[PDB]
């Protein structure tokens, strides 16, 4: 009978992290997804790596 | 708990010349069997708890400790005897059987066999 309340407290804190994880994430990501885009140079890295495909695949 | 032990004896059952229990023994053995099976079923023990590691995985780790101490230090008392006259209200009624019925029964027997001998003669 002992165990289940202990495990409940842990399990809730676990469940309570994931939700905070998605909601945290959602704000952080839904904020900064926007800003990134100024980097032209990831498309710098697209071409660069894209050359290391276009050249370096065959 | 922990409790010790006597096997079936059907001869016993029928005889109870304390008439007020004659039925009871037949039923009472079967009540026994209920316990007999039930005890054979279960084990004595659960495991226990590694509180140290569970404290690692409970962030409210105080709880694990608190309940730990109380539980581990605690021992609950074995469901306690109320009756032990069974042995006794018998073994005395077993004298009731013996001396009282022994003597009368053996003295009768002798007269029978005593006339037969001469009847074989």
* Contact in structure between B63 and B51 (CB atoms under 8 Å): no
DSSP B75: -
Residue B13's CB: how many other CB atoms inside 10 A?
14
For residues B80 and B63, give the distance between their C-alpha atoms in angstroms, rounded to a whole number: 32
* Contact in structure between B83 and A25 (CB atoms under 8 Å): no
Contacts of A6 in chain B (CB under 8 A): 54, 58, 63-64, 67
Of the candidates A42, A51, A9, the one whose C-alpha atom is nearest the C-alpha of residue B59 is A9
Question: If you search the block for the tokens 């605690």, which residue do you land on?
Answer: B74
Technique used to solve these coordinates? cryo-EM
Question: If you search the block for the tokens 């016993």, which residue do you land on?
Answer: B12
3-state helix, strand, coil in chain B (%, to 5): 70, 0, 30
User: For residue B34, is it left (φ>0), alpha (ψ between -120 and 50) or beta?
Assistant: alpha
Min distance A14 CA to chain B CA atoms (Å): 10
CA distances from A14 to A8, B10, B34, B67, B103 (A): 10, 62, 45, 22, 81
Question: Is residue B25 classed exposed, middle or buried when 0-12, 13-18 and 19+ CB atoms within 10 A define those classes?
Answer: middle
Min distance A10 CA to chain B CA atoms (Å): 5
Contacts of B64 in chain A (CB under 8 A): 6
Nominal resolution in Å?
7.4
Question: If you search the block for the tokens 């037949």, which residue do you land on?
Answer: B26
């Amino acid at each position: 009978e002992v165990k289940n309340r202990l495990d409940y407290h842990i399990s809730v804190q676990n469940m309570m992290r994931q939700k905070e994880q998605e909601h945290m994430i959602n704000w952080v990501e839904k904020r900064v997804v926007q800003s990134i885009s100024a980097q032209q140079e990831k498309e710098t890295i697209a071409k660069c790596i894209a050359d290391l495909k276009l050249l370096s695949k065959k | 708990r922990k409790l010790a032990l006597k096997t079936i004896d059907w001869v016993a059952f029928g005889e109870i010349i304390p008439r007020n229990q004659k039925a009871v023994a037949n039923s009472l053995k079967s009540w026994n069997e209920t316990l007999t099976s039930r005890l054979a079923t279960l084990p004595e023990k659960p495991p226990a708890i590694d509180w140290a590691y569970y404290k690692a995985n409970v962030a409210k780790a105080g709880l694990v400790d608190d309940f730990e101490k109380k539980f581990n230090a605690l021992k609950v008392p074995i469901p306690e005897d109320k009756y032990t006259a069974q042995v006794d209200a018998e073994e005395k009624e077993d004298v009731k059987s013996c001396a009282e019925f022994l003597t009368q029964s053996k003295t009768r027997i002798q007269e029978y066999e005593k006339e037969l001998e001469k009847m074989r003669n």
